[PDB]
Amino acid sequence: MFAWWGRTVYRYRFIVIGVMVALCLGGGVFGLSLGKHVTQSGFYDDGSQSVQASVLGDQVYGRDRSGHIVAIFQAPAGKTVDDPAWSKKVVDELNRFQQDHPDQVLGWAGYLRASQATGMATADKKYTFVSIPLKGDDDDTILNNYKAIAPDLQRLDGGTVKLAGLQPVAEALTGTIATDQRRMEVLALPLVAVVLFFVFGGVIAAGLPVMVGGLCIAGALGIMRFLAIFGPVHYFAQPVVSLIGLGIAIDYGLFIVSRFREEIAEGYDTETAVRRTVITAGRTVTFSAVLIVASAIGLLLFPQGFLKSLTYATIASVMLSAILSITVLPACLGILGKHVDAEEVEAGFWGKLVNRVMKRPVLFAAPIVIIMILLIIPVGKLSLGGISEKYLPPTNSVRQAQEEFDKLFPGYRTNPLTLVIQTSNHQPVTDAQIADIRSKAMAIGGFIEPDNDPANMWQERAYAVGASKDPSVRVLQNGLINPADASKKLTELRAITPPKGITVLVGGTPALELDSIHGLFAKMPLMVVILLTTTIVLMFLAFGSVVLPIKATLMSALTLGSTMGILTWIFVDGHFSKWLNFTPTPLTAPVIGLIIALVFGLSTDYEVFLVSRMVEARERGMSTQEAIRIGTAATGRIITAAALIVAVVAGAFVFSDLVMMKYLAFGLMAALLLDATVVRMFLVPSVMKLLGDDCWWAPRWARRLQTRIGLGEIHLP
Ligand SMILES: CCCCCCCCCCC(CCCCCCCCCC)(CO[C@@H]1O[C@H](CO)[C@@H](O[C@H]2O[C@H](CO)[C@@H](O)[C@H](O)[C@H]2O)[C@H](O)[C@H]1O)CO[C@@H]1O[C@H](CO)[C@@H](O[C@H]2O[C@H](CO)[C@@H](O)[C@H](O)[C@H]2O)[C@H](O)[C@H]1O
């Protein structure tokens, strides 16, 4: 299979270099429209009882267009907001902004308009705000409408106004993606180019992995844009495409180009060198890519629309990177030939480190597993959470505006729990039924009494403009003090016994996050099984042995545990926050699953890169110890360079202004730092020496089944 592609990618090395570049360049110019069609919805289990409640509330009671924009106005530096002139002109400026953007601005209500809104002006009368509703029946439509007016909105009062609310914060959160890509393009791509020049020594040899990575990120963006035609694609799709199309899409090029240069040095002519580098390195790259696919395919079981799009992005990027690395790059090398330049590796440093590692293997593995289990201890205080304005750096000037709004006008932002009363007959709900449901619900403590009286608790929702006043659905709502009691009292609410025919759905933003967390935790028992079973079999196919898949699975699990522990200790416990410019916050549950999948997949890739050389050397008659020596001395520099490349790519994203991407990239950095600077150098050789000659053992039926498939060719005569 791989020994046939090596022979057919050289006979037609132009029809593969001119067609697979067309499909990635003209297919990448199609992805330039991806930024418009990416959505921000998908963090919630769309089949839960809280999403149902939110949809019914929006349908019947109309969307809550009150927190979209709040614009804080300040007195004329030694005056009050009740100034006859200043108030008049701020009015006369909010008018002619409502009417000069009629397609985006629904209206505006504030103290400057109605004097009966004393809750919209501070007690000293020096700060006031107005609420600007935005037209749009979809969240992304509302965000686009806000983006169409934001540059002209800030000019009110003369630049003095401060914008806050749902839409400015959403714009700030989604506006960090462009900044991240700009930082990547101007800081990591040239730095990765310099790293590639240092590892290879030529501009042509170093250029080829960059070309493959660029083609991968163009084609993956094109594929994602194609996927956005049918379903929703999240905003996080493109940063992950960048990560996985410039870290591993460049690792694959590194390995294949290095293998080609190794085969050229042996004296093999151009065609034979291409065939052999395919047979070995392209096979290893293909197995690494399918291992990533297997690791990240389990995310398809989770109901979050965020994860279902991020897994598509990951799968598309890795498959395109592998296809490029086995189609275009071998053709690029076959055309170039010996012009890419334009027993000592095993006797140097890498061959002498794993000669002390295997001489006292317990001393180099027991301390490391001990110090790598102690890194798991911090994960106990995980405390997942949700997205808010605090996912921005404390100096964002938008988070600052929102925090100043919260300080000045407390009580306006409510985070209520909503009970959706709904007759099964589709009949007008009797006001006595709402009374009985409220009476049952007015027996659970921990809910915000507005004026310390029961008569205003569990108030009915307000009818908005886009409200279809269905008489068979009524919704009540209260916020709760101590948001930590959300999980404890959501179950207390969901245990009410409706009187005769009512069916109460409990929703609200606090419930929307707990439902997503529980929906994600209800499929870990099967997602983990899939992630383990699909990688064990694939690594048995890659390494014609049974013990090695188990060993690599154990090391990958240990690396994942240590990475999660470090992430918790840094981002949840709040260490190095002042250095990295973030606020210690609860993590997001879907991103934890994404981190698990990516870390497991990439650690397994690095294990495959390390052990494929050992398996290849063993088939050449080498003993078990020599197999390890050659295997991890021939690939030491290449794996170090690949780890540095991905570390640079992720560290370009660690400096992001979004905490989500910060700890995603930092988890990747920690995982690869461990897997390339502790695991590879000490744990794998020591364990493989302790196991003995049984590292290479697969039953006879297993190897003949591997041959029947056609994937067993790990030996080059
Ligand atoms: C790379 C970028 C990708 C996107 C990045 C994320 C962008 C998305 C924005 C995220 C977001 C706006 C955040 C801004 C808040 C500012 C409020 C200012 C108000 C000023 C007056 C809304 O996010 C949207 O929420 C919608 C429904 O909730 C949902 O709509 C759809 O949902 C369904 C289908 O998804 C379906 O039912 C249906 O189709 C739709 O209904 C959208 O899908 C979803 O995007 C989160 O809201 C915030 O979350 C916080 C929970 O932590 C919450 O509590 C915080 O504050 C409390 C203090 O009180 C404090 O106690 C808490 O401790 C604190 O945690 C906040 O109160 C809340 O505001």
HEC string for 307-328: HHHHHHHHHHHHHHHHHHHHHH
Beta-strand ranges (E) seen in 467-545 are 473-479, 505-508
The alpha carbon of 453 and the centre of ligand 1 are apart by a number of angstroms equal to: 29
Structural contact between residues 354 and 627, judged by C-beta atoms closer than 8 angstroms: no
Beta-strand ranges (E) seen in 280-438 are 416-422
In angstroms, the CA 65 to CA 53 distance is: 18
Our CA dihedral for 137, 138, 139, 142, rounded to 10 degrees, sits at: -50
Exposure letters 450-469 (e unless 16+ CB within 10 A, then b):
eeeeeeebbeebeeeeebee
Regarding the beta carbon of 643 and ligand 1, being less than 6 Å apart is answered: no
Q: Which residue from 247, 195, 349, 198 is spatially nearest to 681, judged by alpha carbons? A: 349
In angstroms, the CA 106 to CA 621 distance is: 77
Report which DSSP code applies to 38.
E
In angstroms, the CA 146 to CA 153 distance is: 9
Residue 419 pairs in a beta bridge with 476, 506
In angstroms, the CA 168 to CA 165 distance is: 6
Structural contact between residues 473 and 437, judged by C-beta atoms closer than 8 angstroms: no
Regarding the beta carbon of 389 and ligand 1, being less than 6 Å apart is answered: yes
Sorted by sequence, the CB contacts under 8 Å of residue 9 that are 6+ apart come out as 16, 274, 278, 326, 327, 330, 331, 334
In angstroms, the CA 344 to CA 261 distance is: 16
CA 156 vs CA 98, 122, 162, 452: distances in Å: 12, 20, 9, 39
Tell me how far apart the terminal alpha carbons of the chain are, to the nearest angstrom: 16
Q: Which residue from 289, 307, 175, 176 is spatially nearest to 237, judged by alpha carbons? A: 307
C-alpha torsion sign, points 608, 612, 615, 617: negative
Q: Which residue from 91, 70, 171, 176 is spatially nearest to 404, judged by alpha carbons? A: 70
Regarding the beta carbon of 697 and ligand 1, being less than 6 Å apart is answered: no
The residue contributing the CA closest to ligand 1 atom 21 is 67
The residue contributing the CA closest to ligand 1 atom 47 is 388
- The CA angle 653-658-664, to the nearest 5 degrees, is 55
In angstroms, the CA 394 to CA 303 distance is: 32
In angstroms, the CA 594 to CA 648 distance is: 20
Regarding the beta carbon of 51 and ligand 1, being less than 6 Å apart is answered: yes
Task: Determine which helix (DSSP H) or strand (DSSP E) holds 538, and give its type and residue range.
Answer: helix 524-542
The residue contributing the CA closest to ligand 1 atom 68 is 388
Our CA dihedral for 369, 371, 377, 378, rounded to 10 degrees, sits at: -130
The total of other beta-carbon atoms located within 10 Å of residue 521's CB is 13
Residue 385 pairs in a beta bridge with 588
Q: Which residue from 195, 299, 287, 283 is spatially nearest to 247, judged by alpha carbons? A: 195
Known binding-site residues equal 40-44
The alpha carbon of 615 and the centre of ligand 1 are apart by a number of angstroms equal to: 51
Alpha helices in 228-301 (DSSP H): 237-246, 248-265, 270-277, 283-297
In angstroms, the CA 183 to CA 148 distance is: 25
Q: 308, 408, 415, 659: which to mutate for ligand 1, most atoms within 8 A of CB?
A: 415
Q: 37, 50, 68, 139: which to mutate for ligand 1, most atoms within 8 A of CB?
A: 139
Pair of tokens at residue 234: 């999240």
In this structure, what are the phi and psi dihedrals at residue 109, rounded to the nearest 5 degrees? Answer: -130, 130
Q: Which residue from 595, 603, 684, 688 is spatially nearest to 643, judged by alpha carbons? A: 603
In angstroms, the CA 229 to CA 242 distance is: 21
Structural contact between residues 548 and 631, judged by C-beta atoms closer than 8 angstroms: no
In the numeric block, the tokens 């592609």 are attached to 5
Instruction: Return the SS3 of 506.
Output: strand
Judge residue 133's burial from the number of C-beta atoms within 10 Å of its C-beta, 0-12 exposed, 13-18 middle, 19 or more buried: buried
In angstroms, the CA 672 to CA 603 distance is: 7
In angstroms, the CA 193 to CA 263 distance is: 23
Regarding the beta carbon of 412 and ligand 1, being less than 6 Å apart is answered: yes
Q: Which residue from 310, 185, 330 is spatially nearest to 193, judged by alpha carbons? A: 185
Pair of tokens at residue 285: 């790259």
Per DSSP bridges, beta strands 38-39 and 233-234 are parallel
C-alpha atoms less than 13 angstroms from C-alpha of 382 in its C-beta half-sphere: 15
The alpha carbon of 240 and the centre of ligand 1 are apart by a number of angstroms equal to: 22
In the numeric block, the tokens 């809280």 are attached to 50
| Method used experimentally | cryo-EM
Structural contact between residues 609 and 284, judged by C-beta atoms closer than 8 angstroms: yes
CA 256 vs CA 161, 338, 351: distances in Å: 56, 15, 22
The 3 state secondary structure assigned to 94-115 is HCCCCCCCCCCECCCEECCCCC
The alpha carbon of 411 and the centre of ligand 1 are apart by a number of angstroms equal to: 17
The alpha carbon of 483 and the centre of ligand 1 are apart by a number of angstroms equal to: 15
